[PDB]
Design an enzyme around this catalytic site. Structure first.
Site, mmCIF file in Angstrom:
data_model
loop_
_atom_site.group_PDB
_atom_site.id
_atom_site.type_symbol
_atom_site.label_atom_id
_atom_site.label_comp_id
_atom_site.label_asym_id
_atom_site.label_seq_id
_atom_site.Cartn_x
_atom_site.Cartn_y
_atom_site.Cartn_z
ATOM 1 N N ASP A 167 -3.762 4.378 2.358
ATOM 2 C CA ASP A 167 -4.234 4.764 3.697
ATOM 3 C C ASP A 167 -3.917 6.204 3.945
ATOM 4 O O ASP A 167 -2.800 6.644 3.677
ATOM 5 C CB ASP A 167 -3.642 3.914 4.817
ATOM 6 C CG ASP A 167 -3.829 2.428 4.627
ATOM 7 O OD1 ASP A 167 -4.894 2.020 4.116
ATOM 8 O OD2 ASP A 167 -2.910 1.675 4.977
ATOM 9 N N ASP B 162 0.816 -1.187 0.000
ATOM 10 C CA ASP B 162 0.000 0.000 0.000
ATOM 11 C C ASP B 162 0.854 1.243 0.000
ATOM 12 O O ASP B 162 2.074 1.156 0.028
ATOM 13 C CB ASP B 162 -0.944 -0.037 1.211
ATOM 14 C CG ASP B 162 -0.411 0.192 2.622
ATOM 15 O OD1 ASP B 162 0.822 0.423 2.794
ATOM 16 O OD2 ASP B 162 -1.223 0.419 3.506
ATOM 17 N N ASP C 191 0.901 4.892 2.152
ATOM 18 C CA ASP C 191 0.379 5.571 3.320
ATOM 19 C C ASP C 191 0.781 7.012 3.346
ATOM 20 O O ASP C 191 1.881 7.346 2.946
ATOM 21 C CB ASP C 191 0.855 4.889 4.597
ATOM 22 C CG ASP C 191 0.599 3.418 4.677
ATOM 23 O OD1 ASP C 191 -0.428 2.970 4.133
ATOM 24 O OD2 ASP C 191 1.410 2.722 5.287
HETATM 25 CO CO LIG Z 1 -0.872 1.094 5.304
HETATM 26 MG MG LIG Z 2 2.822 0.751 4.158
#
Ligand SMILES: [Co+2]
Ligand SMILES: [Mg+2]
Ligand code: NA
Length: 358
Positions: free
Chosen positions: A282, A195, A197
């Site tokens: 995120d 991901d 962030d």
């Molecule tokens: Co994350």
């Molecule tokens: Mg990460």
DNA sequence: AAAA
């Protein structure tokens, strides 16, 4: 002398002991699955300290003076030195429960409980889970299955940068003074991640403006047809509460777990199918005065954060979490405008983000 | 379960 604390070690991405640490990481992950927290912690601390070494272990003599290496761990190191393999880690990789738990939790929305449930139902493949006509899936799992191939492929730096541009463009539309920082693995120098962030903070935004930004940004992306999945967790942040005493501290800031549609045209790489990629993103929103604590917490690694908090408590009688730093002797909260000031408050030499890969 |  190598410290027992990751926050007193420099751990860079040039791991000279991947043969040992890959085996120790597998054994730690299996102990997590088998709910053996103690054995999990012992393998994680041993793997962490070997990751910090500037040279490869090539004999048992090379382990002299290294902390966090118990008899169990030293037997595993000895076995790898013997024939280049870990029989213990090889047995975990061939275990049916371990294989199933790794495979099932690779789906976004599937954790330890759902993976255990499906295993005890006799499922072993994702194909059999997805096509079953009795199973009921959460909205998170539906997204996890729908975008599975994109989410399991690693996010690279050109993609992370493309996502950063999208985040910044959306955020400044509603809060032009906002500071958006990429955190996690990419901030520690990683080439890939599961991901991307981000930490968002605004020096002039009100309590209400701070609360509404993630709703405004996601509604904008929903209008743009870019929001594939969205879950916003409201803030439970308390301005005057003492920091967490827990081994693994919870983050109380407003945050969202997203899946974004990333158009290939926005990616400036060396290199195409449907023309877009699903990316897990995120976003964390925090009050301006707590930006250094949140940045330090979200940069990681998980082991570096555990040892920072452990060192603060046991060596300095301080309480540290993603929101604040409290001095139990002086009975005061310590302010910080940067991560450097947090390290200085703790009596630690500053560790660069690329040196926190513990 | 989502989390470094
Ligand atoms: Co994350
Ligand atoms: Mg990460
Ligand atoms: Na999962």
């Amino acid at each position: 002398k190598i410290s027992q604390y990751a926050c007193q070690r420099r751990t860079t991405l040039n791991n000279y002991n991947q043969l040992f640490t890959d085996a120790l990481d597998i054994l730690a992950e299996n102990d997590e699955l088998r709910e053996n927290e103690g054995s999990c912690l012992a393998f994680m601390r041993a793997s962490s300290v070997l990751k910090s070494l500037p040279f490869p272990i090539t004999s048992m003599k090379d382990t002299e003076g290294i902390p966090c290496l118990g008899d169990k761990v030293k037997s595993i190191i000895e076995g790898i030195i013997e024939d280049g393999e870990s029989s213990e880690a090889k047995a975990v990789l061939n275990d049916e429960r371990y294989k199933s738990f790794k495979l099932f939790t690779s789906v976004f929305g599937v954790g330890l409980k759902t993976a255990e449930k499906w295993f005890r139902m006799g499922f072993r493949t994702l194909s059999k889970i997805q096509s079953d006509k009795s199973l009921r899936f959460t909205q998170m799992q539906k997204a996890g299955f729908l975008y599975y191939e994109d989410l399991v492929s690693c996010v690279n730096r050109p993609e992370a940068e493309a996502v950063s541009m999208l985040v910044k463009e959306a955020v400044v539309t509603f809060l032009p003074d906002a500071l958006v920082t990429m955190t996690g693995g990419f901030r520690r120098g990683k080439m890939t991640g599961h991901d991307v962030d981000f930490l968002i903070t605004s020096p002039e935004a009100t309590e209400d403006e701070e609360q509404q930004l993630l709703h405004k940004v996601t509604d904008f992306w929903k209008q743009q047809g870019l929001l594939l999945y969205c879950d916003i967790l409201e803030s439970t942040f308390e301005k005057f509460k003492q920091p967490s005493r827990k081994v693994d501290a919870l983050d109380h800031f407003q945050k969202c777990f997203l899946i974004l549609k990333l158009d290939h045209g926005r990616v400036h790489s060396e290199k195409e199918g449907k023309g877009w990629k699903a990316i897990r993103v995120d976003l964390v929103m925090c009050p301006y005065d707590r930006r250094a604590f949140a940045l330090l917490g979200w940069t990681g690694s998980r082991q570096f954060e555990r040892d920072l908090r452990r060192y603060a408590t046991h060596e300095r009688k301080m309480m540290l979490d993603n929101h604040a730093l409290y001095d139990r002797t002086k009975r005061v909260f310590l302010e910080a405008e940067s991560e450097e000031e947090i390290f200085a408050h703790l009596g630690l030499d500053y560790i660069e983000p690329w040196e926190r890969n513990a």
